[PDB]
Enzyme design. Structure first.
Site, mmCIF file in Angstrom:
data_model
loop_
_atom_site.group_PDB
_atom_site.id
_atom_site.type_symbol
_atom_site.label_atom_id
_atom_site.label_comp_id
_atom_site.label_asym_id
_atom_site.label_seq_id
_atom_site.Cartn_x
_atom_site.Cartn_y
_atom_site.Cartn_z
ATOM 1 C CB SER A 89 36.679 38.053 38.579
ATOM 2 O OG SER A 89 35.952 36.900 38.941
ATOM 3 C CG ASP A 188 40.661 32.599 43.352
ATOM 4 O OD1 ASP A 188 39.529 32.507 43.873
ATOM 5 O OD2 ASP A 188 40.967 33.465 42.503
ATOM 6 C CG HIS A 218 38.477 35.815 43.391
ATOM 7 N ND1 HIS A 218 38.854 35.081 42.289
ATOM 8 C CD2 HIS A 218 37.470 36.621 42.983
ATOM 9 C CE1 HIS A 218 38.106 35.428 41.258
ATOM 10 N NE2 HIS A 218 37.258 36.361 41.651
#
EC number: 3.1.1.1
Lengths: 242, 242
Positions: A89, A188, A218
């Protein structure tokens, strides 16, 4: 009470970077897998992370970036000549940046955001993170509520700088040349998955790969496809010159 | 003297399409591998192919396309309800075209060209193919030269239609929706490898993947990474609904 880790193994080193509101626990299993394959790994923890949510509020990317750089230096001072980096991320956004800042063997971005969210939306996410943390502490709905109301008295002034980080790295993707493996959950729920196409298409790296995971969410490192993820990252690292 | 092949296995069927100047031998090992995994495979041979080079120059894409369609029909007529297609080089272009012409479960393009080569360059390719074929026939250098002088006396009037095919499929990539896996040799010497990015980015498929192979030449099915290629295609096929 998560802690930064350092799995010592072979001469090839990999810096593992977590995401916003996350911590080293989110990339530990990946570090363990890479260690078993002979890769020494180091995962720092950003300031404001791995501590109560109240301490996150006054930290921003300028602080987390220091943790990223010191993490890289950690490995260097330890004697490791060539270093690769995998980020989850926001960690992926920092990996790209590190990629055009210091010598990097290979870059792995995992569901890195490349779209700019509004402050309102980011803050909502921080609120969910705080409330979820207090729940995990065992506190009651009553105490949670009271602490969350106190929590809201202090706005997070660093969300504008977080928007600036994403925009800046996005604007400088053409500075990335190191071999890059763009990893992304097709479905996601936290970021726009199209972010993966922007990274893959805009970097200048002669060696670039992108792979979509159809079942994962995610936080791909903790989802049902982690074993395939591990194999793919390992294969990618093994394909580098070193 | 190569021949079409039909490897009967389960209900999931895969049409295997070869490239310009190639024949079924080029996709045979892939066929055997998929068969060994339970997939029924059929590979036709394009008119003008699998025979002496003198025959090739009198054929064109309008001919070859009929062999591709009859290949698809071959499987339909045998009861196979769902059909996927994998094509090598020009076979990949026909795979994409087939993908928006009839129902296709999945598409695999392997080193498919999307750039238009000049007619002269294409013909140079045909001359090289003819010479090598004659060499494999055990003819002396002197005999080969005599036959090549003759060969050059007959222009191949269909190279213009070959340019038309590539332009036409390229113009219509946005019509492709079926799941697609773009395979490409990073250091392809026969076609512009950037062709892979054009396919990946311009098709409309919700499910699309692209993978680069760092140590393979153009005829990727016959090179050193074929075992990995086989595994990737199998994994991709397995990821489809069927």
């Amino acid at each position: 009470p998560p802690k930064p880790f350092f799995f010592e193994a072979g001469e090839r080193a990999v810096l593992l970077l977590h995401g916003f509101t996350g911590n080293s626990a989110d990339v530990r299993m990946l570090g363990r897998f890479l260690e078993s394959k002979g890769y020494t790994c180091h995962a720092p923890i950003y300031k404001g992370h791995g501590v109560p949510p109240e301490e996150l509020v006054h930290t921003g990317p300028d602080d987390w970036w220091q943790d990223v750089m010191n993490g890289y230096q950690f490995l260097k001072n330890k004697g490791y000549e060539k270093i690769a980096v995998a980020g989850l991320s926001l960690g992926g956004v920092f990996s790209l940046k590190l990629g055009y800042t210091v010598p990097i063997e290979g870059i792995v971005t995992m569901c890195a955001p490349m779209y700019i969210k509004s402050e309102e939306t980011m803050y909502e996410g921080v609120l969910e993170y705080a409330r979820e943390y207090k729940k995990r502490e065992g506190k009651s709905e009553e105490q949670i509520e009271q602490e969350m109301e106190r929590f809201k008295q202090t706005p997070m002034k660093t969300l504008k700088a977080l928007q600036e980080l994403i925009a800046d790295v996005r604007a400088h993707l053409d500075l990335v040349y190191a071999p890059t493996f763009v990893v992304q959950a097709r479905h996601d729920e936290m970021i726009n998955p199209d972010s993966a196409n922007i990274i893959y298409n805009e970097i200048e790296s002669p060696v670039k790969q992108i792979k979509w995971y159809e079942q994962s969410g995610h936080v791909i490192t903790l989802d049902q496809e982690k074993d395939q993820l591990h194999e793919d990252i390992y294969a990618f690292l093994e394909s580098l010159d070193w």
